[PDB]
């Protein structure tokens, strides 16, 4: 959090919604002529084939599994949250410009954790890294670390040297610093501070970080936490809520982006229900280990 304005994140990525839709359409027209065949899925022989868009594209169903597998490798290796967040940012910025039906996902996850841990000054050697990626997944990863580091080379090639990225956690620390002032004089309980930190940790899914500044995401998760803590006669009682409403109004952090972030959190927690490991894990198994 040096200065997000006049950084590289505000300039050469973080495009608007129409530009992201146009780039996704260019990705779709790129993968159109690649394989019009589809996928030969077999279990009971049984061989139906999807259309190019029934699923296993970048809409929703595998992103939760992607975040779960990144976090599993993270807490297995026991590295801090900023490295896994930067690895998830590299994951999304690579899958925007390349498909997933041609790239081994587990090596991409281990490669992104490797590159983010190296660039955010908390290094992990390649021996223990590929040994953990083998001891958690005994398949889908070669013993050669050279293939992992050639993946590292092409990952550095694709996201063209834009490695460092500001995080919403620093702006959350700044907001909870400024909320201890004589204009407001409030402070959350430590369980709701952990709830807001967990919501920020959960919002790295669902494709929001490529559109808005991170302080808007921090304000959105803190608003969801405060307005979901306040109610569990008068309507807007518990004046922590009142001081937060006056803070969000009197400061000119704008609306209509926080609305989209809250609606995106609602649709993420809606899409979490119809999610199962079985179909996507079997689809990966029949997409790589045929």
């Amino acid at each position: 959090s040096g200065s997000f304005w006049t950084s590289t994140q505000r300039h050469h990525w973080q495009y608007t919604k129409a530009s992201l839709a146009k780039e996704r359409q260019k990705l779709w027209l790129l993968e159109c002529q690649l394989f019009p065949q589809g996928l030969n899925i077999v279990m009971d022989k049984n061989i139906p084939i999807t259309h190019r868009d029934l699923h296993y594209d970048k809409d929703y169903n595998l992103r939760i599994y992607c975040y779960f597998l990144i976090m599993k490798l993270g807490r297995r290796l026991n590295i801090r949250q900023y490295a896994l967040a930067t690895a998830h940012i590299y994951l999304s910025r690579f899958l925007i410009k390349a498909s997933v039906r041609e790239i081994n996902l587990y090596m991409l996850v281990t490669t992104c954790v490797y590159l983010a841990c190296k660039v955010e000054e908390c290094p992990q050697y390649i021996r223990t890294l590929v040994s953990e990626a083998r001891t958690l997944w005994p398949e889908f990863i070669p013993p050669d670390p050279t293939k992992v580091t050639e993946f590292e080379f092409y990952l550095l090639e694709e996201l063209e040297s834009y490695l460092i990225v500001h995080h919403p956690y620093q702006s959350l620390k700044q907001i909870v610093q400024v909320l201890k002032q004589p204009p407001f004089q409030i402070t959350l309980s430590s369980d709701d501070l952990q709830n807001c930190w967990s919501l920020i940790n959960d919002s790295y899914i669902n494709d929001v970080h490529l559109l808005y500044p991170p302080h808007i995401i921090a304000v959105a998760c803190l608003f969801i936490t405060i307005s979901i803590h306040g109610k569990p006669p008068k309507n807007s009682s518990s004046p922590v809520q009142i001081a937060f409403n006056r803070f969000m109004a009197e400061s000119l952090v704008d609306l209509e982006e926080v609305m989209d972030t809250i609606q995106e959190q609602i649709t993420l927690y809606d899409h979490w229900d119809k999610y199962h490991e079985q179909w996507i894990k079997f689809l990966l198994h029949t997409l790589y280990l045929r």
Binding site: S1, G2, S3, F4, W5, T6, Y67, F68, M71, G74, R75, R80, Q81, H166, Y169, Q170, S171, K173, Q174, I175, Q177, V178, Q181, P183, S190, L193, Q194, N195, W197, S198, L199, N201, D202, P213, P214, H215, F223, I224, S227, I228, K231, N235, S236, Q241, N245, F247, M248, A249, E250, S251, L252, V253, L255, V258, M259, I262, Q265, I266, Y269, W272
Partner: protein, 194 residues
């Protein structure tokens, strides 16, 4: 100096608290390095040990799925009504221009151009100053002499070839200043005499 320094300022950015004293307000997502007291206390007490800050909240790196469970059905309308109240407070207090005048249906400000006690030399040159087509509008509008009879205004207007819009502005200004003066000097206010 020769070139301006790097003070790293923001561009045009609203701080988190505009009510605060103007030099200790933190701009959003914006923090330059500055020498202070806690930094040197850390440097003094933390040599030969190595300094690194573990995060504030215990149990980081965990999804809030079994932590905020029913955030869809039971708990969406409260968020909608609270954000409606924030939107209403914003549009009604922060952005709406307040009319702080209780006299007439003009805005605050809008004084008439002030009459100055001018003799015929400076007025004689000022009417020639109006008559051109390249002169400014603000500097001319900052003053207008008084005692201008209507015969003299219309006479020098059609005699000195004043442009049409400036002539209409001058005639309307004389109209308004005579109306305001004659409404000032009124002793009795009966229904019909105002």
């Amino acid at each position: 100096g020769s070139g301006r320094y790097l003070l790293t300022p923001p561009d045009d950015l609203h701080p988190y608290v505009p009510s605060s004293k103007p030099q200790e307000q933190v701009y959003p997502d914006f923090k330059p390095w500055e020498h202070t007291a806690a930094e040197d206390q850390i440097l003094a007490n933390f040599v030969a040990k190595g300094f690194y800050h573990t995060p504030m909240v215990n149990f980081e790196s965990i999804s809030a799925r079994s932590s905020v469970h029913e955030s869809l059905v039971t708990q969406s309308n409260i968020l909608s009504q609270q954000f409606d109240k924030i939107i209403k407070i914003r549009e009604d207090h922060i952005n709406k221009i307040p009319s702080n005048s209780t006299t007439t249906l003009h805005g605050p400000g809008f004084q008439l151009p002030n009459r100055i006690t001018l003799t015929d030399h400076r007025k004689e040159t000022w009417l020639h100053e109006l008559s051109s087509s390249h002169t400014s509008l603000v500097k001319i509008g900052k003053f207008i002499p008084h005692g201008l009879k209507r015969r003299q205004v219309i006479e020098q207007c059609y005699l000195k070839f004043i442009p049409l819009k400036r002539a209409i502005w001058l005639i309307k200004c004389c109209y308004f200043i005579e109306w305001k003066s004659n409404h000032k000097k009124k002793r009795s206010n009966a229904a019909g005499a105002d």
